[PDB]
Amino acid sequence: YRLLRQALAECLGTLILVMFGCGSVAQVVLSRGTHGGFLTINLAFGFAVTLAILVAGQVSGAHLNPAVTFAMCFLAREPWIKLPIYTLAQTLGAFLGAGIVFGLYYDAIWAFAGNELVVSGPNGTAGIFATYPSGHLDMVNGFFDQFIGTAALIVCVLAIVDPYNNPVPRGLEAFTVGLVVLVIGTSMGFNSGTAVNPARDFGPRLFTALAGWGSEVFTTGQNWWWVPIVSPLLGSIGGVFVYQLMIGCHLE
Amino acid sequence: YRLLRQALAECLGTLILVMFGCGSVAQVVLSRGTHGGFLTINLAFGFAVTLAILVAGQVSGAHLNPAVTFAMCFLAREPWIKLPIYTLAQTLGAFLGAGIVFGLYYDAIWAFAGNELVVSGPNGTAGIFATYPSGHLDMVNGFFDQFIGTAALIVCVLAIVDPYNNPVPRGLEAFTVGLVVLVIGTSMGFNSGTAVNPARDFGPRLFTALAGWGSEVFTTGQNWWWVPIVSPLLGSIGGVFVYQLMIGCHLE
Amino acid sequence: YRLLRQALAECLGTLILVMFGCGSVAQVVLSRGTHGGFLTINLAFGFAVTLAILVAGQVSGAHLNPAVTFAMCFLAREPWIKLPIYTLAQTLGAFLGAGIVFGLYYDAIWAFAGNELVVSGPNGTAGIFATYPSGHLDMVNGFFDQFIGTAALIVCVLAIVDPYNNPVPRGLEAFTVGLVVLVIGTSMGFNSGTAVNPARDFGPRLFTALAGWGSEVFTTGQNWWWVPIVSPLLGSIGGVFVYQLMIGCHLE
Amino acid sequence: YRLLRQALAECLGTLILVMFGCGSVAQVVLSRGTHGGFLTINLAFGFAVTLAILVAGQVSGAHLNPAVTFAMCFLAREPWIKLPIYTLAQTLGAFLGAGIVFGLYYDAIWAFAGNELVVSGPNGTAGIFATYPSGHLDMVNGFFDQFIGTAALIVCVLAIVDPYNNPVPRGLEAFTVGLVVLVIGTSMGFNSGTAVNPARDFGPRLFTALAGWGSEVFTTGQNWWWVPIVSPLLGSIGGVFVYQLMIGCHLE
């Protein structure tokens, strides 16, 4: 099936960005203040997004983001039947990409806090895979950051893949989206490796539930796990209206 | 109206660079010496300029700078009626981009100096949005830096958008201008996140006047606020003569 | 002979990446914690790979990696007679590139530990040219990192040079492969400047055996020298199956 | 005259790279260990070379290097009458670019050592404009670094501007040469902001002789001033033979 081929490309693409992105967070977290800080995490996530789009772009268009897929279906650019398949294909691959990172750092992760896995705290390793609320990442503060960050990502994506504009060459899309992701982490959020991808957050978080961290990965932070899912979905809706009201509606 | 469509693209483009640029300054300023220094500020401003040009380039040409627009009208490449509309459209968006950054860091900004907003000093947050004169950024020292930095930016822009040369592809313009902005901050000025854009300085400064910082944002530093406006305008005139005398006049 | 011209391009290309890559490691190792850390090493190796592909790409395709050449012959894209010649041509050039770095830092290297060459330890200089097992780079831990890193490199290379996709422009291949190498070092491995190139590891290691470090460069670490050779070769096989099962087989 | 137009482009191009390059060295040197280190100096010099080629490339080909011009005339690609005019045009502009940096940092430079200009030492500012021999930059050690660095630069330039290869697009040349310069500083030399351009070294050094530093800028270091001139010229000869023997001679 043609739609099965595109789902496989989205699965591999989201595997690349999660495996590369979570591996750099594991390097910083496990080697406390020795192998870089936030700059190397931001560049790795931005570079991984560029690489993942180049690999999977020629098949499925390389959305690699349920929020981006939701925005495409909202504008009727893609059928609504692509939304559940892409979301499932993107979540699977973030789950698999998290497993590869777990295998890479299996001994270092288990030795971070003796011989047990801790979700949050000073000796906490669950934050390598999924985001957890810090002092300045409360429910209200975190919701606003993910809403604005996803709206900015949607506007930049729509401005590059616009049919009414000149057909962009290959590579330009990959390096543009990797540029937005790099600058969103640098600017938005006091502490956020990546908070604009619902699949990049739920997939690895679901892996840690079964990897041995327990069910505390969902109940911690007053059930914060649904914030990195709903807020980027709302932010993609806001980013569509901004692009249409500023640029899109006048291109007719 | 056709000229209304171009004004909307300039408004959104200047919103992107101010929101991304001021967000990275807020990260460094609020988290004192923890989330990077001047290198991350310079890269973010350079990357934001590249992103803003890519988004708004296909409509208005993505000047995103009143000095660049003034240089274009000086060379009779654009009508003089575009200068006031673009300047107003660029200033609005730097005003809106500053408001988004204020919302993102609302609790952190208010808690930097207790429960009040301070313009300048050790616990000063008004420098996140607009430039203020430091020890080595006096009136004479600051004027020379903005004059030279804007002259260098104009020459590089004119050399890329030159009709007499080969038609440059899309993306080349965006990455070239983002390269100039990145290297101007690294080289020119002992301390300057961005000092080559009059709209990027006056817009956010006007926001802080009404946001709660008071009217001290204009009277501080012996009324320094007009320097980041007049000096880049004069520097753009100087950059036009340099390009014409070196390259432009001999392309006939 | 046509196949002799391609071997000469592979020899020069592998010389560039080893000479540039090992020179940056020598800067960090000899100047202990003064001239950068792991970020500058990673960028230099990534930039050197981009430069080496641009120089040698137009002649031999710029594999510059026996694992990449092995993957190409496995997919029957190149004849099996190219594998031994390219591997010999890639190993010679890593040997010569290591000699140039030895000449550049001849006095600094000899003065690192008095007036003698030490393979491993605190005053050890043999790690400039070849990788040696650290605390978290044991046989099992090291084998897994090189297997995964080479599988990721193969998938990205196959997705760019795919005949069934659109013909990529020049430069896109060079910057893509340099991006994978940069992000592999940042993410995979707790400490690895480059561990995805068998020629980049054996060539410089063979040079140190004759340069004066002795035969200890092979017997150290329970004979670790064969791990950076066999594991990337197996990883390239794994990367071929992943690409074929996800993307390649459905492009017919 | 046609050859006068090309000389003016070379003058402006070398002005850009010296003004941007020396400004970043002044930031690091004057603000001791506060505004970055060697990484920001290397990126600025690499980015300035990319910018200078883009501005002046369409007119004169943007050699911006007497060693590159000498290599072009050696291969009979350009007439020998271009060598003295380009060298004079490149040296003038490095002289002017140094004057702009002197004006930018006039008060900071004079206050580095009280109220006098010192060539070398702890409070020395002449090293902002020209290279001076450090502990590991002796005559023999320095000569080898500049010879190898210029040979590597020539090979990369010849591989990109080769007529026998596919015609490279604009921008690819500028970003390639800026990549070589960035990685030469990172790898070659224990301490070298840029040591592959004879005009970038003699021009600013001649400015400091008349700016107030005195004639000590030539007699210091056992008359080291001629090393950054002769050695890159010899290195360009070596880089031509390497490229011809590896790639060039077999492209017929």
Side-chain angles (χ1 to χ4, degrees):
Chain A
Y1 196 25
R2 169 151 172 70
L3 215 77
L4 170 96
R5 299 170 62 256
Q6 317 199 282
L8 284 162
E10 294 283 308
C11 177
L12 178 56
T14 324
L15 198 148
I16 280 146
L17 70 99
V18 166
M19 160 197 65
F20 283 125
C22 278
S24 320
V25 180
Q27 277 248 66
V28 172
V29 162
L30 292 164
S31 95
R32 341 187 187 217
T34 311
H35 262 91
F38 304 99
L39 199 33
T40 165
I41 286 180
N42 284 342
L43 299 158
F45 258 114
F47 287 161
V49 165
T50 307
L51 276 176
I53 290 164
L54 282 167
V55 171
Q58 290 284 83
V59 189
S60 58
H63 298 174
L64 312 174
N65 201 317
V68 172
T69 308
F70 184 40
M72 281 333 144
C73 300
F74 197 72
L75 282 172
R77 271 170 193 185
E78 322 287 339
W80 280 103
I81 202 182
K82 270 201 199 178
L83 183 61
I85 284 151
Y86 273 38
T87 303
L88 176 137
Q90 280 143 2
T91 320
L92 179 81
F95 182 88
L96 302 166
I100 289 158
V101 175
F102 193 49
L104 282 162
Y105 302 89
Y106 184 80
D107 301 279
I109 280 161
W110 270 95
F112 205 64
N115 210 234
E116 46 152 74
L117 296 173
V118 191
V119 175
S120 195
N123 294 330
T125 36
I128 285 153
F129 307 94
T131 55
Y132 289 85
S134 300
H136 258 310
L137 208 76
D138 282 338
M139 289 267 170
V140 188
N141 284 26
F143 197 97
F144 186 83
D145 272 284
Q146 273 130 42
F147 183 91
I148 298 303
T150 323
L153 173 99
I154 286 313
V155 168
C156 297
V157 165
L158 292 176
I160 265 67
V161 306
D162 180 55
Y164 282 81
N165 274 338
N166 217 51
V168 291
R170 209 183 148 196
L172 181 66
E173 206 271 15
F175 283 90
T176 291
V177 183
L179 207 66
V180 193
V181 168
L182 206 143
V183 81
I184 280 167
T186 314
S187 318
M188 271 129 270
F190 242 151
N191 213 296
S192 86
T194 289
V196 296
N197 203 323
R200 179 254 164 274
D201 214 274
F202 182 69
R205 185 176 256 118
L206 183 66
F207 174 79
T208 46
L210 329 166
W213 276 272
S215 64
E216 267 142 11
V217 305
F218 293 115
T219 88
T220 184
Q222 261 68 70
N223 313 85
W224 152 268
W225 69 276
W226 67 265
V227 186
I229 302 172
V230 174
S231 158
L233 290 181
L234 298 174
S236 70
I237 293 163
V240 160
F241 294 138
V242 160
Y243 171 83
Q244 294 291 280
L245 172 128
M246 290 329 248
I247 294 168
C249 269
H250 324 119
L251 286 166
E252 67 101 13
Chain B
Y1 196 25
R2 169 151 172 70
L3 215 77
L4 170 96
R5 299 170 62 256
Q6 317 199 282
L8 284 162
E10 294 283 308
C11 177
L12 178 56
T14 324
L15 198 148
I16 280 146
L17 70 99
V18 166
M19 160 197 65
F20 283 125
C22 278
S24 320
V25 180
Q27 277 248 66
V28 172
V29 162
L30 292 164
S31 95
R32 341 187 187 217
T34 311
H35 262 91
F38 304 99
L39 199 33
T40 165
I41 286 180
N42 284 342
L43 299 158
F45 258 114
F47 287 161
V49 165
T50 307
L51 276 176
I53 290 164
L54 282 167
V55 171
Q58 290 284 83
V59 189
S60 58
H63 298 174
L64 312 174
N65 201 317
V68 172
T69 308
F70 184 40
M72 281 333 144
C73 300
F74 197 72
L75 282 172
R77 271 170 193 185
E78 322 287 339
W80 280 103
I81 202 182
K82 270 201 199 178
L83 183 61
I85 284 151
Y86 273 38
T87 303
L88 176 137
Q90 280 143 2
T91 320
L92 179 81
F95 182 88
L96 302 166
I100 289 158
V101 175
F102 193 49
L104 282 162
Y105 302 89
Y106 184 80
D107 301 279
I109 280 161
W110 270 95
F112 205 64
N115 210 234
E116 46 152 74
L117 296 173
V118 191
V119 175
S120 195
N123 294 330
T125 36
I128 285 153
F129 307 94
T131 55
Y132 289 85
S134 300
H136 258 310
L137 208 76
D138 282 338
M139 289 267 170
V140 188
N141 284 26
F143 197 97
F144 186 83
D145 272 284
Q146 273 130 42
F147 183 91
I148 298 303
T150 323
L153 173 99
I154 286 313
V155 168
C156 297
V157 165
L158 292 176
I160 265 67
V161 306
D162 180 55
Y164 282 81
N165 274 338
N166 217 51
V168 291
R170 209 183 148 196
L172 181 66
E173 206 271 15
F175 283 90
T176 291
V177 183
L179 207 66
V180 193
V181 168
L182 206 143
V183 81
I184 280 167
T186 314
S187 318
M188 271 129 270
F190 242 151
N191 213 296
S192 86
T194 289
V196 296
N197 203 323
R200 179 254 164 274
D201 214 274
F202 182 69
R205 185 176 256 118
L206 183 66
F207 174 79
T208 46
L210 329 166
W213 276 272
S215 64
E216 267 142 11
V217 305
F218 293 115
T219 88
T220 184
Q222 261 68 70
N223 313 85
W224 152 268
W225 69 276
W226 67 265
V227 186
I229 302 172
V230 174
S231 158
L233 290 181
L234 298 174
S236 70
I237 293 163
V240 160
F241 294 138
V242 160
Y243 171 83
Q244 294 291 280
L245 172 128
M246 290 329 248
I247 294 168
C249 269
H250 324 119
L251 286 166
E252 67 101 13
Chain C
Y1 196 25
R2 169 151 172 70
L3 215 77
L4 170 96
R5 299 170 62 256
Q6 317 199 282
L8 284 162
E10 294 283 308
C11 177
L12 178 56
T14 324
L15 198 148
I16 280 146
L17 70 99
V18 166
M19 160 197 65
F20 283 125
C22 278
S24 320
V25 180
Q27 277 248 66
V28 172
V29 162
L30 292 164
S31 95
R32 341 187 187 217
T34 311
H35 262 91
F38 304 99
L39 199 33
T40 165
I41 286 180
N42 284 342
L43 299 158
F45 258 114
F47 287 161
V49 165
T50 307
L51 276 176
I53 290 164
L54 282 167
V55 171
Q58 290 284 83
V59 189
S60 58
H63 298 174
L64 312 174
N65 201 317
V68 172
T69 308
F70 184 40
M72 281 333 144
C73 300
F74 197 72
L75 282 172
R77 271 170 193 185
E78 322 287 339
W80 280 103
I81 202 182
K82 270 201 199 178
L83 183 61
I85 284 151
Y86 273 38
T87 303
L88 176 137
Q90 280 143 2
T91 320
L92 179 81
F95 182 88
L96 302 166
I100 289 158
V101 175
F102 193 49
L104 282 162
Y105 302 89
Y106 184 80
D107 301 279
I109 280 161
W110 270 95
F112 205 64
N115 210 234
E116 46 152 74
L117 296 173
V118 191
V119 175
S120 195
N123 294 330
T125 36
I128 285 153
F129 307 94
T131 55
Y132 289 85
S134 300
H136 258 310
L137 208 76
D138 282 338
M139 289 267 170
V140 188
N141 284 26
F143 197 97
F144 186 83
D145 272 284
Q146 273 130 42
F147 183 91
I148 298 303
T150 323
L153 173 99
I154 286 313
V155 168
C156 297
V157 165
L158 292 176
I160 265 67
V161 306
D162 180 55
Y164 282 81
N165 274 338
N166 217 51
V168 291
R170 209 183 148 196
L172 181 66
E173 206 271 15
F175 283 90
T176 291
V177 183
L179 207 66
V180 193
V181 168
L182 206 143
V183 81
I184 280 167
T186 314
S187 318
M188 271 129 270
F190 242 151
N191 213 296
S192 86
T194 289
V196 296
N197 203 323
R200 179 254 164 274
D201 214 274
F202 182 69
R205 185 176 256 118
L206 183 66
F207 174 79
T208 46
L210 329 166
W213 276 272
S215 64
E216 267 142 11
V217 305
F218 293 115
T219 88
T220 184
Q222 261 68 70
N223 313 85
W224 152 268
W225 69 276
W226 67 265
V227 186
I229 302 172
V230 174
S231 158
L233 290 181
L234 298 174
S236 70
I237 293 163
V240 160
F241 294 138
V242 160
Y243 171 83
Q244 294 291 280
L245 172 128
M246 290 329 248
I247 294 168
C249 269
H250 324 119
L251 286 166
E252 67 101 13
Chain D
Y1 196 25
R2 169 151 172 70
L3 215 77
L4 170 96
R5 299 170 62 256
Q6 317 199 282
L8 284 162
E10 294 283 308
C11 177
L12 178 56
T14 324
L15 198 148
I16 280 146
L17 70 99
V18 166
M19 160 197 65
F20 283 125
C22 278
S24 320
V25 180
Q27 277 248 66
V28 172
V29 162
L30 292 164
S31 95
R32 341 187 187 217
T34 311
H35 262 91
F38 304 99
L39 199 33
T40 165
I41 286 180
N42 284 342
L43 299 158
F45 258 114
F47 287 161
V49 165
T50 307
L51 276 176
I53 290 164
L54 282 167
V55 171
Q58 290 284 83
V59 189
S60 58
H63 298 174
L64 312 174
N65 201 317
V68 172
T69 308
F70 184 40
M72 281 333 144
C73 300
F74 197 72
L75 282 172
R77 271 170 193 185
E78 322 287 339
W80 280 103
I81 202 182
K82 270 201 199 178
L83 183 61
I85 284 151
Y86 273 38
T87 303
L88 176 137
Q90 280 143 2
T91 320
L92 179 81
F95 182 88
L96 302 166
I100 289 158
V101 175
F102 193 49
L104 282 162
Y105 302 89
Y106 184 80
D107 301 279
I109 280 161
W110 270 95
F112 205 64
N115 210 234
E116 46 152 74
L117 296 173
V118 191
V119 175
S120 195
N123 294 330
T125 36
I128 285 153
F129 307 94
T131 55
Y132 289 85
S134 300
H136 258 310
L137 208 76
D138 282 338
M139 289 267 170
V140 188
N141 284 26
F143 197 97
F144 186 83
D145 272 284
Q146 273 130 42
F147 183 91
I148 298 303
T150 323
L153 173 99
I154 286 313
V155 168
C156 297
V157 165
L158 292 176
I160 265 67
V161 306
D162 180 55
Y164 282 81
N165 274 338
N166 217 51
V168 291
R170 209 183 148 196
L172 181 66
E173 206 271 15
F175 283 90
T176 291
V177 183
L179 207 66
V180 193
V181 168
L182 206 143
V183 81
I184 280 167
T186 314
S187 318
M188 271 129 270
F190 242 151
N191 213 296
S192 86
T194 289
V196 296
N197 203 323
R200 179 254 164 274
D201 214 274
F202 182 69
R205 185 176 256 118
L206 183 66
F207 174 79
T208 46
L210 329 166
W213 276 272
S215 64
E216 267 142 11
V217 305
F218 293 115
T219 88
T220 184
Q222 261 68 70
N223 313 85
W224 152 268
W225 69 276
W226 67 265
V227 186
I229 302 172
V230 174
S231 158
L233 290 181
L234 298 174
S236 70
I237 293 163
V240 160
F241 294 138
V242 160
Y243 171 83
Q244 294 291 280
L245 172 128
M246 290 329 248
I247 294 168
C249 269
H250 324 119
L251 286 166
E252 67 101 13

